[PDB]
Design an enzyme around this catalytic site. Structure first.
Site, PDB file in Angstrom:
ATOM      1  N   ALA A 278      16.738 -32.890 -17.990  1.00  8.49           N
ATOM      2  CA  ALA A 278      16.151 -32.546 -19.289  1.00  8.49           C
ATOM      3  C   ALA A 278      14.803 -31.785 -19.079  1.00  8.49           C
ATOM      4  O   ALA A 278      13.989 -31.656 -20.004  1.00  8.49           O
ATOM      5  CB  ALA A 278      15.935 -33.826 -20.097  1.00  8.49           C
ATOM      6  N   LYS A 279      14.597 -31.281 -17.839  1.00  5.48           N
ATOM      7  CA  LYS A 279      13.415 -30.556 -17.408  1.00  5.48           C
ATOM      8  C   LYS A 279      13.489 -29.084 -17.854  1.00  5.48           C
ATOM      9  O   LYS A 279      14.494 -28.390 -17.645  1.00  5.48           O
ATOM     10  CB  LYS A 279      13.139 -30.765 -15.898  1.00  5.48           C
ATOM     11  CG  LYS A 279      13.831 -29.835 -14.900  1.00  5.48           C
ATOM     12  CD  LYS A 279      12.925 -28.675 -14.468  1.00  5.48           C
ATOM     13  CE  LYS A 279      11.883 -29.033 -13.437  1.00  5.48           C
ATOM     14  NZ  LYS A 279      10.570 -28.420 -13.764  1.00  5.48           N
TER      15      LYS A 279
ATOM     16  N   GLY B 131      13.770 -36.046 -15.605  1.00  4.72           N
ATOM     17  CA  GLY B 131      15.211 -35.813 -15.482  1.00  4.72           C
ATOM     18  C   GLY B 131      15.610 -34.364 -15.261  1.00  4.72           C
ATOM     19  O   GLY B 131      14.805 -33.563 -14.766  1.00  4.72           O
TER      20      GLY B 131
ATOM     21  N   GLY C 177       8.705 -29.895 -19.474  1.00  9.77           N
ATOM     22  CA  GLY C 177       9.807 -30.811 -19.219  1.00  9.77           C
ATOM     23  C   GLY C 177       9.656 -31.512 -17.881  1.00  9.77           C
ATOM     24  O   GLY C 177      10.048 -30.972 -16.847  1.00  9.77           O
ATOM     25  N   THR C 178       9.077 -32.718 -17.894  1.00 10.23           N
ATOM     26  CA  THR C 178       8.905 -33.547 -16.698  1.00 10.23           C
ATOM     27  C   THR C 178       9.539 -34.942 -16.915  1.00 10.23           C
ATOM     28  O   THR C 178       8.894 -35.861 -17.442  1.00 10.23           O
ATOM     29  CB  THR C 178       7.429 -33.566 -16.240  1.00 10.23           C
ATOM     30  OG1 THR C 178       6.563 -33.671 -17.374  1.00 10.23           O
ATOM     31  CG2 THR C 178       7.059 -32.337 -15.427  1.00 10.23           C
TER      32      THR C 178
ATOM     33  N   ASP D  77      24.305 -36.617 -33.291  1.00 10.64           N
ATOM     34  CA  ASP D  77      23.002 -37.077 -32.775  1.00 10.64           C
ATOM     35  C   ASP D  77      21.849 -36.402 -33.522  1.00 10.64           C
ATOM     36  O   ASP D  77      20.876 -35.967 -32.898  1.00 10.64           O
ATOM     37  CB  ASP D  77      22.897 -36.830 -31.250  1.00 10.64           C
ATOM     38  CG  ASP D  77      21.767 -37.540 -30.511  1.00 10.64           C
ATOM     39  OD1 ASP D  77      21.188 -38.506 -31.084  1.00 10.64           O
ATOM     40  OD2 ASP D  77      21.459 -37.133 -29.357  1.00 10.64           O
TER      41      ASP D  77
HETATM   42  N1  LIG Z   1      14.615 -31.340 -23.400  1.00 12.49           N
HETATM   43  C1  LIG Z   1      13.863 -30.795 -24.560  1.00 12.49           C
HETATM   44  C2  LIG Z   1      12.911 -29.676 -24.145  1.00 12.49           C
HETATM   45  C3  LIG Z   1      12.300 -28.913 -25.319  1.00 12.49           C
HETATM   46  O1  LIG Z   1      12.415 -27.498 -25.099  1.00 12.49           O
HETATM   47  C4  LIG Z   1      13.530 -26.820 -25.588  1.00 12.49           C
HETATM   48  C5  LIG Z   1      14.794 -27.375 -25.492  1.00 12.49           C
HETATM   49  C6  LIG Z   1      15.917 -26.714 -25.972  1.00 12.49           C
HETATM   50  C7  LIG Z   1      17.251 -27.341 -25.899  1.00 12.49           C
HETATM   51  C8  LIG Z   1      17.647 -28.391 -25.097  1.00 12.49           C
HETATM   52  N2  LIG Z   1      18.930 -28.632 -25.388  1.00 12.49           N
HETATM   53  N3  LIG Z   1      19.390 -27.802 -26.348  1.00 12.49           N
HETATM   54  C9  LIG Z   1      18.356 -27.027 -26.651  1.00 12.49           C
HETATM   55  C10 LIG Z   1      15.740 -25.475 -26.582  1.00 12.49           C
HETATM   56  C11 LIG Z   1      14.485 -24.906 -26.682  1.00 12.49           C
HETATM   57  C12 LIG Z   1      13.359 -25.565 -26.191  1.00 12.49           C
HETATM   58  C13 LIG Z   1      12.047 -24.855 -26.369  1.00 12.49           C
HETATM   59  O2  LIG Z   1      12.014 -23.647 -26.588  1.00 12.49           O
HETATM   60  N4  LIG Z   1      10.919 -25.604 -26.290  1.00 12.49           N
HETATM   61  C14 LIG Z   1       9.584 -25.135 -26.283  1.00 12.49           C
HETATM   62  C15 LIG Z   1       9.230 -23.918 -25.711  1.00 12.49           C
HETATM   63  C16 LIG Z   1       7.913 -23.502 -25.726  1.00 12.49           C
HETATM   64  C17 LIG Z   1       6.943 -24.290 -26.299  1.00 12.49           C
HETATM   65  C18 LIG Z   1       7.280 -25.500 -26.866  1.00 12.49           C
HETATM   66  C19 LIG Z   1       8.596 -25.925 -26.860  1.00 12.49           C
END
Ligand SMILES: [NH3+]CCCOc1cc(-c2cn[nH]c2)ccc1C(=O)Nc1ccccc1
Length: 316
Positions: A23-24, A21, A18-19, A129
């Protein structure tokens, strides 16, 4: 910094994925269970109502196809959200790699979408959304819904229901959103697409879309039931669950009810928390049922995840 000091008491941090905002998103590792997590790092100092709406919804929603919230950790400068590990990527990235999916394959995916949203609606909420960027895959190739920024509110236009764009909204707009999703899975392109926004609102209202040659009449029928311009004309979730396309290679309707409970405490997990927190059941069984989304809530839920993978139930 000094903001990560309460975080580093509980999580051994990892690779950033996450790079851009707040949103990281950093990968993480739970110290006690040894289970893999994802940490969203928000700074309040830098949209924070979207953070508050999300947290509130996730605290009350608990489902096998909703990305679980484990821990909320709030220092002076930063809000940390500890969420389920989805290594399988976006459904968006899955589609754009594959060059569209087969009807057989889209159904496997779509029945998991129906399941999540039917529960969201049963709980009084509407996501607002829904798009393939907001559905992620876990390590067992099963989908998990994300981004509850808008809830029971305009998301992305290509996915927005006509009545919503007009300002005449609440859960029917999600049914349309799923109808846009169903099309993109099977075609590999949007049913309504243009350059400008005023051109894209014009195409949605009129509601005419292309029917690619490779689409089955079963798909064609469901698409026109879901992509109705009138939301009164739009097919009800009750009828979606047991639709004959939904059923085609499964002889049973979508199991939408949550297998992940709020009231029920796992006996293996309540006892293993005791032998580490130095207490007994009844005193612990009520302490877990507080659901404060602190370290105890993260430790319980991740232990309940650990047991489900087949591994022995233990904290360090
Ligand atoms: N801003 C989006 C980032 C994506 O990552 C996540 C976001 C949320 C999220 C954000 N908002 N609500 C839920 C929940 C879980 C993940 C996640 O586990 N991603 C991930 C982890 C390891 C490898 C690949 C992907």
């Amino acid at each position: 910094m000094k903001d990560y000091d309460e975080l580093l008491k509980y999580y051994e941090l990892h690779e950033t994925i996450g790079t851009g905002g707040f949103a990281k998103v950093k990968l993480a590792c739970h110290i006690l269970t040894g289970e893999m997590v994802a940490i969203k790092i928000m700074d309040k100092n830098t949209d924070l109502p979207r953070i508050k709406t999300e947290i509130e919804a996730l605290k009350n929603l608990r489902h096998q196809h909703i990305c679980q919230l484990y821990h909320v950790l709030e220092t002076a400068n930063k809000i940390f959200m500890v969420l389920e590990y989805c290594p399988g990527g976006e459904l968006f990235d899955y589609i754009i790699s594959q060059d569209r999916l087969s009807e057989e394959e889209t159904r496997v995916v779509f029945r998991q979408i129906v399941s999540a949203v039917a529960y969201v609606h049963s709980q009084g909420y509407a996501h607002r959304d829904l798009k393939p960027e907001n559905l992620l895959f876990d390590e067992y190739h099963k989908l998990k819904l994300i981004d509850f920024g808008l809830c029971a509110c305009c998301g992305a236009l290509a996915y927005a229901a006509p009545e919503l764009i007009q300002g005449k909204s609440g859960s029917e707009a999600d049914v349309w959103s799923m109808g846009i999703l169903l099309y993109v899975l099977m075609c590999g392109f949007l049913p309504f697409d243009d350059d400008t926004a005023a051109a894209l609102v014009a195409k949605i209202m009129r509601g005419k879309y292309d029917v690619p040659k490779w689409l089955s009449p079963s798909s064609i029928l469901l698409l026109q039931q879901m992509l109705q311009v009138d939301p009164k004309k739009r097919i009800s979730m009750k009828n979606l669950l047991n639709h004959p396309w939904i059923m085609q290679d499964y002889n049973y309707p979508v199991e939408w009810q949550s297998k992940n409970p709020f009231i029920h405490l796992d006996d293996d997990c309540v006892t293993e928390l005791s032998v580490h927190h130095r207490n007994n059941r009844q005193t612990m069984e009520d302490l877990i049922s507080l659901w404060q989304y602190d370290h105890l809530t993260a430790t319980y839920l991740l232990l309940l995840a650990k047991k489900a993978r087949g591994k022995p139930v233990r904290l360090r």
